[PDB]
Amino acid sequence: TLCGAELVDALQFVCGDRGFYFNTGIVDECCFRSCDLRRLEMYCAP
Amino acid sequence: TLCAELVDALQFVCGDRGFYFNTGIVDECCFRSCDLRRLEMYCAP
Amino acid sequence: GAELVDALQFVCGDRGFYFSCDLRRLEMYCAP
Amino acid sequence: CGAEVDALQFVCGDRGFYFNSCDLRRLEMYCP
Amino acid sequence: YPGEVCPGMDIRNNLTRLHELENCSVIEGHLQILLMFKTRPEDFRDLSFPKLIMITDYLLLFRVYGLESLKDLFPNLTVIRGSRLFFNYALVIFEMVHLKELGLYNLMNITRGSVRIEKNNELCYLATIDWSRILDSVEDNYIVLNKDDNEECGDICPTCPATVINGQFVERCWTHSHCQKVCPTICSHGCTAEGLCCHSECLGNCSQPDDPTKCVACRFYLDGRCVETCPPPYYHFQDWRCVNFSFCQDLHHKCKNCHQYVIHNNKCIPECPSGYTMNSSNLLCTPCLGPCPKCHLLEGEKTIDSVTSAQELRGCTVINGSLIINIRGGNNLAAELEANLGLIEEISGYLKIRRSYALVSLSFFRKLRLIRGETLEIGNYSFYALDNQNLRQLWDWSKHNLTITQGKLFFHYNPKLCLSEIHKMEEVSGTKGRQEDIALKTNGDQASCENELLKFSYIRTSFDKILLRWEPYWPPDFRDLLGFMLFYKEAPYQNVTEFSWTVVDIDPPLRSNQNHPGWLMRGLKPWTQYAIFVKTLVTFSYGAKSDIIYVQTDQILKELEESSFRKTFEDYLHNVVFVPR
Amino acid sequence: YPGEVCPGMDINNLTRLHELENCSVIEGHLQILLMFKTRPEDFRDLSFPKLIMITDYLLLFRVYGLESLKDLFPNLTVIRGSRLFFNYALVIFEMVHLKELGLYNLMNITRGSVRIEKNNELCYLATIDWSRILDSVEDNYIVLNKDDNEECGDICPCPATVINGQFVERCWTHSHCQKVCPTICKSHGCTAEGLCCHSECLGNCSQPDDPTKCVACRFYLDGRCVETCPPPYYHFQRCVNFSFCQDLHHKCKCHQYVIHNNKCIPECPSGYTMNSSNLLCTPCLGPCPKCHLLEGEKTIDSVTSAQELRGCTVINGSLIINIRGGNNLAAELEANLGLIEEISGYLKIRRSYALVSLSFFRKLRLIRGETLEIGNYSFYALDNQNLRQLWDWSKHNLTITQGKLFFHYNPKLCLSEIHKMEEVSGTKGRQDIALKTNGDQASCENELLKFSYIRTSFDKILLRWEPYWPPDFRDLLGFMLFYKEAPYQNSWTVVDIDPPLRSQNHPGWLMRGLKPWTQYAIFVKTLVTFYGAKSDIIYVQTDQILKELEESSFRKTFEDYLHNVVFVPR
């Protein structure tokens, strides 16, 4: 489970130098339920 | 509603006539309402 | 104690009195 | 207070003790 | 015995009824004198029944308006066995108006039951009776609302043994001229004026020591003396006397021309036990093939509020109705329930628990196999639980095998019942997924069970403190674990009960993507033993405790609400600022 | 204004922030987020001093190297708060190296609160007084920062005010402090010499007593600020002319735009319809309430969630009031979702800690119930600790077509008000209501205990009230009196009193320990075994324990048992 400050760290590890994306969320998909690297790379910039 | 009060009521009704011996008298008088018609029946014949 | 008897004056008033400290226990000493 | 470091004395002991609310974690990271 | 044997009688309004006791010695029943309102002490000055030695079930006096002392009516009534009680009581005296002296100075033992002398307006001389030398458990007796509530009498104390039952030495007396015979422990058999103990097969009082024939009371009774076991040609009867000559035949023929009678195991009993039948000739039970369990319920229900309600089901195996266990008062009734209603295996109806304050376990149903739902509870329930403060266990579910054929269960306001025990039955009882039940907030809210195990890891004790350290525990959400709390009790004796017991809080450790969250516990006296364990505090939409480990030296709930707010904004912020491609 | 008008923006790379260079006002919101590669040498020489005004809110989160905002925002003066971020207009969250805030020129935030939490170096926090910035301070939450187990000293460079009776100096940075202007101009803005500019101005200004020399103002047309825009210029969120609203409408034809009440608003209000000739909205005889909900669901956890239903009248879905934190959100909830007469779905109230009433549904006629909660409930309640009253049933009419009510744990909600629902709503019987968790800590005993005698003395008082007896007099365990030296008619001292003995021995108590010539507020309330009555609070001037309940129940049981056995009918 990636919750709270852990989720930011995990998305930073996954994003690298790509950066995040902009323009019922990330908490439910990764805090309440198990999440993997296969569905956390889709929050990064294309 | 007669609920010690029941003893005084039964004595005031029966008096020297006395009581009888071979749900009950509480649920019939303490919970519900009772009159002289259903309380005198406890006195001895 | 004497602090209770004189205090009892404010309970009986002018009617007088004579020989958990609830009022019902204090009404025992009164005019009669 | 003061030397009553005795908790630090017992926790550190031979490991080492120097001065570069209370909780063991504060004293554990307090002090080679 | 100076007299014959009496049936139990109820003495009603007029005093002409009480004269039947004149030629009586044994009342193998109960004695009730009741509701004689138009009487004065002048009617009781010269009315005495001195030849009463034996009462077997219970003595109750109620609303006598003339009696002020029992020293004349029953001067040497020596024992009340307690075969049949009166709502867990063997001696009840209630609302005696002009009674002030209890009398009964010669009463020796009550083998089974308690005593309730309550709401007696003029009664005193009560604090001078040591009930430990009369009955077994004083903690079950209830004397309350007597004259001692407001004004204390001046006890004569005529000058008699004194023992520390209260906080200090006090003399124990009955009347203005009598007191309690506290026989030394060398003799239940009892001792006479010179101190010589009585025969082993007797209790209370004896004329000449070491003689079965010289006894008035005795723990069975042969025709002439009292013996440990009735002789071969005499069977037991009414748990007190040995009669064989024509008794079981005469009662059996009298009943036919009520309780039938039979002979079994050298003991005359009203009905053959389970699985036994009547050969109609010898009056002996014989083992009979074909399952023949014992009990019809005329009302269709039975509220087990006391022992006498449970005793009506003694030897019962099948109930043709519903049981409503409705015990009140907090008295430890667990021992007596199993003896009476423990052989019950099959119930034809629902089983209900309401306001059972005392009950801590329902295991007294030692052989409860099947709860048939025929004649079910209105509401479609076949097992119930409401307002049971001290219920923390239902069954030892590693061994018991229960079956339910009908509707579901209800559970409300069981503050000490862990939800693990409740949920465990649904898998084992056999009612999975067949509903047409449970209140989470009111089950175990006072004695919250911690499901997980928090094993210790390190122990470092010293001359004035101790060092503890346990393995980390983190829920699925690390933010859920609010913190820790540590308990000690410094109990000298091992095997201390679960949650003195001082509470003190500890903050969680940082995760560091672990540090042992133990505590530098201080303030222990240099030698004494200590008992400690740690437990987690968490928020819920889980929870662990350490076993009670033993070692010797060498309105405020807004914080939970505040924590939920802290999670809500951080959750809200993450949901908005992170968007998938 | 030294720049143009900007929309809101979210800024990974720091170089994206360059768009603020030619900016003066952002009518949206400013979010700067998630620069995980920057370091303080990328913030030494980046300044945007021409940013005048932020309308909605400013949020900075996970920025590495932004130790101070002095360079970035030295002239940001007002963050009005048209659109909030979970009840907050200023949020700074998990800034790693931020230690000094730096925006000394910020003066007012018209609507909102401030959230600064989990910032591991910020320390210049106890030296900013928010009463001069916000209308309320009990709603703000600054909780976890550097100064939770440490103090940097707060080296002031300045006016001082009281925290709890002790004066402390208020400062922003090492070289600046807060401008606590005197009350002569409450919000217009005192200058260096103490003079105040025109009333139609907020915070800061150049030449006193002039509408034109201001920079921030409470509307604004052209180089001056006025109370209401001139007739040729309609209002905006700004004072815009006919060009702006038509330009936006043609650009979208994405929000349409309509001229209404001299105010260019996006969509026509309820009961008003648009004709393509002109953008003025005219009243329509045909009824036409407004709110489509995706997935038929909307959880009102904050003002922002409530604000999306502003002017809403019919909800085409379900509402889940889930307010958390204990903040009084009643007024904003009414102002946002108080016009929704009709709700097409189910209404639910879970874990609403602060909610004392649901009266903010001031116009709520018809809960339809086409879609229902599990268990088929159309009105639900759980863990509402401070909920003590639903709609004022004396004058409020509600209709529920289908579904049943539910009430699990409302410790301050009376059962009488719960039962009063079934009569008015129309659901005479459909049930779900836990009788021992609603009003368990409430004093809503319906019966009345009228006082009868009052006798006051120099140090004592005498009270006597009319006797009360339940249908079974043995249920009256006793009495409980409460007094407290109340300062005005607008905790209590609990005592225990034994019940009177029947015969009337007018029950009462003799007051003791009172100080002379001071007023007291009192009432007596019964305790019973399960009714209940209380005395209406009168004012007069001085001219583990639950075992006892079990003992009383046991005492009734045996006395009841004895009568059932010894009294037999003929």
Curated annotation (Swiss-Prot), chain B:
**What binding partners and quaternary form does the record give?**
Forms a ternary complex with IGFR1 and ITGAV:ITGB3. Forms a ternary complex with IGFR1 and ITGA6:ITGB4. Interacts with SH2D3C isoform 2. Forms a ternary complex with IGFBP3 and ALS.
Q: What does the UniProt record say this protein does?
A: The insulin-like growth factors, isolated from plasma, are structurally and functionally related to insulin but have a much higher growth-promoting activity. May be a physiological regulator of [1-14C]-2-deoxy-D-glucose (2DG) transport and glycogen synthesis in osteoblasts. Stimulates glucose transport in bone-derived osteoblastic (PyMS) cells and is effective at much lower concentrations than insulin, not only regarding glycogen and DNA synthesis but also with regard to enhancing glucose uptake. May play a role in synapse maturation.
The highest taxon in the source lineage is: Eukaryota
Report the disease annotation for this entry: Insulin-like growth factor I deficiency: An autosomal recessive disorder characterized by growth retardation, sensorineural deafness and intellectual disability.
Q: What is the effect of changing residue 32 to W?
A: Found in a patient with primordial dwarfism; uncertain significance
The family line of this record is: Belongs to the insulin family.
From the UniProt record, report the name of the gene that encodes this protein: IGF1
Q: What is this protein called?
A: Insulin-like growth factor 1
Organism, scientific name: Homo sapiens (Human)
Where in this protein does the record put region B?
1-22
Q: Which cysteine residues pair off into disulfide bonds?
A: 3-30, 14-43, 29-34
What does the record give as the organism's lineage?
Answer: Eukaryota, Metazoa, Chordata, Craniata, Vertebrata
* Intracellular or extracellular location(s): Secreted
Q: Where is this region: A?
A: 24-44
Curated annotation (Swiss-Prot), chain F:
Q: Impact of mutating residue 239 to Y?
A: In IRAN type A
> Which cysteine-cysteine pairs are annotated as disulfide bonds in the entry?
6-23, 123-152, 156-171, 158-177, 181-190, 185-196, 197-205, 201-214, 217-225, 229-239, 245-264, 252-254, 268-281, 284-288, 291-312, 414-444
**Phosphoserine, modified sites:** 352, 359
The record lists the effect of residue 438 to S as:
In IRAN type A
The segment annotated Insulin-binding runs over 559-567
Q: Outcome of residue 25 to A?
A: In LEPRCH; Verona-1
Q: What is the effect of changing residue 302 to L?
A: In RMS and LEPRCH
Record-listed Phosphotyrosine modification sites = 353
The record lists glycosylation at 13, 22, 75, 108, 204, 241, 275, 316, 376, 397, 490
Q: What is the effect of changing residue 90 to Q?
A: In LEPRCH; inhibits receptor processing
- UniProt-reported outcome of changing residue 56 to G: In IRAN type A
Effect the entry attributes to changing residue 338 to S: In RMS; may impair receptor processing
Query: From what superkingdom does this record's organism come?
Result: Eukaryota
Name of the protein described by the UniProt record? Insulin receptor subunit alpha
Q: Which residues of the full protein are shown?
A: 30 to 756 of 1382
